[PDB]
Amino acid sequence: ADSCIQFTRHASDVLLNLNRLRSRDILTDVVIVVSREQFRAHKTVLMACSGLFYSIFTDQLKCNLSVINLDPEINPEGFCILLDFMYTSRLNLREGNIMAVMATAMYLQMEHVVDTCRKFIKASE
Amino acid sequence: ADSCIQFTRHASDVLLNLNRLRSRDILTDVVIVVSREQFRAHKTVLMACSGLFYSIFTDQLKCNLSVINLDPEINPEGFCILLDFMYTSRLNLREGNIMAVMATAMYLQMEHVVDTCRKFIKASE
Amino acid sequence: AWVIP
Amino acid sequence: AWVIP
Ligand SMILES: CNC(=O)[C@H](C)Nc1cc(=O)[nH]c2ccc(Nc3ccnc(Cl)c3C#N)cc12
Ligand SMILES: CNC(=O)[C@H](C)Nc1cc(=O)[nH]c2ccc(Nc3ccnc(Cl)c3C#N)cc12
Ligand SMILES: [Cl-]
Ligand SMILES: [Cl-]
Ligand SMILES: [Cl-]
Ligand SMILES: [Cl-]
């Protein structure tokens, strides 16, 4: 109905709780392997944030996998920064990590992150 | 780090995608039964929104259940309205449903919804 | 919080 | 959108 009222903070409060479940390893259902590093997560949050994970977990065979191995060229710190962004809306973008973050966001298909990386790089040229 | 940048719309965009997955029945992992009605959902979203579901799905036996039956006194339309609110931040509160919505939100332990129901009822006294 | 969206 | 939170 068009007569709904809306609770402004609801979406951010849901995301905070999903991150608390991730921190406590509650109902995590996939491990993402990035070279020597493993990251536990919820498939639904990954799909909701990434075009690559949306494609992976909607595939009729890959939806059932409990381990996903990323391309060996992917930087684990870049992936960690993006996984934290998925669960918090906050991106720890620094001069020392921006190239790895942008490459990882292009691979994961995270357009808004790629856009802000491109802008920060362009400002330093 | 405290040097993070933040994408304002991220949390609302994640919630929109979680609702799209719910609509398409993608990676839903529980059925909530409310008398004669069944509602498919994601356990993590339910836990993130409700004190009752947070308690249920953190229990070492109930976390593994694929069907949860609610108390027979719970109104299915009231539950449906609250499940839609969990996934959208929008509450379809009407004169004809407010009593059932408030009773259901008290049972589910959804404090902000109970508070707005109490205010709307108090305004009509 | 609550608002008219 | 991006802001300083
Ligand atoms: C133009 N390219 C695209 O649309 C690619 C295929 N997708 C994304 C790209 C992107 O940059 N970010 C996404 C974030 C979430 C999602 N996830 C979704 C997008 C739409 N509906 C749903 Cl149900 C989901 C989920 N979960 C996708 C992208
Ligand atoms: C005072 N009573 C409480 O704190 C009760 C036990 N809980 C809630 C109550 C409530 O009104 N809303 C919640 C919403 C989400 C959640 N879910 C969580 C709360 C805290 N940490 C986590 Cl990880 C979750 C989740 N998922 C709980 C409540
Ligand atoms: Cl597997
Ligand atoms: Cl993004
Ligand atoms: Cl079961
Ligand atoms: Cl609430």
Side-chain angles (χ1 to χ4, degrees), chain A residues 1-8 10-59 61-72 74-94 96-110 112-118 120-121 123-125, chain B residues 1-8 10-59 61-72 74-94 96-110 112-118 120-121 123-125, chain C, chain D:
Chain A
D2 66 325
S3 63
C4 289
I5 53 174
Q6 177 177 91
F7 191 67
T8 303
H10 181 76
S12 57
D13 288 345
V14 166
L15 198 63
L16 181 72
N17 285 336
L18 293 175
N19 198 32
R20 288 167 170 165
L21 295 176
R22 183 178 63 122
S23 183
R24 297 161 58 190
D25 203 30
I26 298 170
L27 290 177
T28 49
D29 55 8
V30 74
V31 180
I32 308 302
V33 179
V34 188
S35 292
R36 287 182 185 268
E37 316 286 333
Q38 296 181 21
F39 298 91
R40 295 192 55 88
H42 302 97
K43 290 172 182 181
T44 55
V45 175
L46 299 180
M47 296 165 86
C49 296
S50 155
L52 184 71
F53 290 125
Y54 178 52
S55 293
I56 292 169
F57 300 124
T58 55
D59 178 82
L61 288 180
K62 302 187 187 78
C63 67
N64 289 322
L65 296 174
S66 66
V67 180
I68 298 296
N69 298 305
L70 306 187
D71 189 296
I74 301 305
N75 182 257
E77 182 190 34
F79 184 74
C80 186
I81 287 165
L82 289 168
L83 183 64
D84 280 343
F85 167 74
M86 292 186 188
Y87 276 88
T88 66
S89 311
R90 288 165 188 244
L91 185 70
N92 183 19
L93 198 55
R94 294 174 68 86
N97 69 32
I98 186 161
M99 301 311 289
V101 171
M102 187 172 74
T104 309
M106 290 169 63
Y107 170 76
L108 297 182
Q109 303 167 29
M110 297 171 71
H112 298 119
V113 173
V114 176
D115 287 343
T116 194
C117 287
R118 285 187 172 145
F120 276 41
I121 292 165
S124 278
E125 293 174 349
Chain B
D2 66 325
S3 63
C4 289
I5 53 174
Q6 177 177 91
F7 191 67
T8 303
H10 181 76
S12 57
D13 288 345
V14 166
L15 198 63
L16 181 72
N17 285 336
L18 293 175
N19 198 32
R20 288 167 170 165
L21 295 176
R22 183 178 63 122
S23 183
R24 297 161 58 190
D25 203 30
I26 298 170
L27 290 177
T28 49
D29 55 8
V30 74
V31 180
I32 308 302
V33 179
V34 188
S35 292
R36 287 182 185 268
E37 316 286 333
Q38 296 181 21
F39 298 91
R40 295 192 55 88
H42 302 97
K43 290 172 182 181
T44 55
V45 175
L46 299 180
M47 296 165 86
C49 296
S50 155
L52 184 71
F53 290 125
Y54 178 52
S55 293
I56 292 169
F57 300 124
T58 55
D59 178 82
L61 288 180
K62 302 187 187 78
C63 67
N64 289 322
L65 296 174
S66 66
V67 180
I68 298 296
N69 298 305
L70 306 187
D71 189 296
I74 301 305
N75 182 257
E77 182 190 34
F79 184 74
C80 186
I81 287 165
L82 289 168
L83 183 64
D84 280 343
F85 167 74
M86 292 186 188
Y87 276 88
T88 66
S89 311
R90 288 165 188 244
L91 185 70
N92 183 19
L93 198 55
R94 294 174 68 86
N97 69 32
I98 186 161
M99 301 311 289
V101 171
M102 187 172 74
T104 309
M106 290 169 63
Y107 170 76
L108 297 182
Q109 303 167 29
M110 297 171 71
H112 298 119
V113 173
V114 176
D115 287 343
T116 194
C117 287
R118 285 187 172 145
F120 276 41
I121 292 165
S124 278
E125 293 174 349
Chain C
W2 293 90
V3 302
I4 302 297
Chain D
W2 293 90
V3 302
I4 302 297

